[PDB]
């Protein structure tokens, strides 16, 4: 199917507690495969998936050089953005960046992404054309001028259409037994009385990969979007994910409710009911 690669950077200042920390993590879909942390005892790019371990020392040294240089660049950027917003030297601030490439089921580039935020708010983003920018405010317009001068958009477009897709396809091949394997959810419906007149129906989905899933409750074939308690999809810690959806139903009407499950790993979508 469809696949993506993303790098996530977090740069966080901490006045009076040393220089800003820089974190980089890399993902293919919902699988992390690398980490870099400037606070580590010996900062170096480390593997976080078994299929990346086969990469040679030149790969690891190249990644570490890039992240060590980004650690320095982001310290300068934090200083600059503090100035752009006329902020005091006392508070802790964060720059985040998320970028990467999306492939379609044919392996071709669907689109590229490059987005930055400041204190959790959109700051600057590379437009879908991979040539122009969307600056959130007059501070981000200063960054936009600097990035145009360094021809950042052109360098990003070359990477997103080039190295990004090439390395993503390499990883998908090297890790094909897990990255190209969709594990369907294991499902069940639980029933718990909340009173004499009402009961909770909980529809579970366990052990699935990737994290993308649709869990809905219907009453007489009508979506119960408003009355459904949906927990955020959560990691199991073994690469798989979990989710549940619950509805409080009148006692005796349980059979009017159906749980619907959509996931990439299922031979066919599921319709489940409480089985007393």
């Amino acid at each position: 199917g469809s696949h993506s690669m993303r790098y996530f950077y977090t740069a966080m200042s901490r006045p009076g507690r040393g220089e800003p920390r820089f974190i980089a993590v890399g993902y293919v879909d919902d699988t992390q495969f690398v980490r870099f942390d400037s606070d580590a005892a010996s900062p170096r790019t480390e593997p976080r998936a078994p299929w990346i371990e086969q990469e040679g020392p030149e790969y690891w040294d190249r990644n570490t050089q890039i992240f060590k240089t980004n650690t320095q660049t982001y310290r300068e950027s934090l200083r600059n953005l503090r100035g752009y917003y006329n902020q005091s030297e006392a508070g802790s601030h964060i720059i985040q960046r998320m970028y990467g490439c999306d492939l379609g089921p044919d392996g071709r580039l669907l689109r590229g992404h490059d987005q930055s935020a400041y204190d959790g708010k959109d700051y600057i983003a590379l437009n879908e054309d991979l040539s122009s920018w969307t600056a959130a405010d007059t501070a981000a317009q200063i960054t936009q001028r600097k990035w145009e001068a360094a021809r950042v958009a052109e360098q990003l477009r070359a990477y997103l259409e080039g190295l990004c897709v090439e390395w993503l396809r390499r990883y998908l091949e090297n890790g094909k037994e897990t990255l190209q394997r969709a594990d369907p959810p294991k499902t069940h419906v639980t029933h718990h009385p909340v009173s004499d007149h009402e009961a909770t129906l909980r529809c579970w989905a366990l052990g699935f990969y990737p994290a993308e899933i649709t869990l809905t409750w219907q009453r007489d074939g009508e979506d119960q979007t408003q009355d459904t308690e949906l927990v955020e999809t959560r990691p199991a810690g073994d690469r798989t994910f979990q989710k549940w959806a619950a509805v409080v139903v009148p006692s005796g009407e349980e059979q009017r409710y159906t749980c619907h499950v959509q996931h990439e790993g299922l031979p066919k979508p599921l319709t489940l009911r409480w089985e007393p």
Partner: peptide, 9 residues
């Protein structure tokens, strides 16, 4: 593989 540069903002 990551993008090779981060340009000062």
């Amino acid at each position: 593989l990551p993008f090779d540069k981060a340009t000062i903002m």
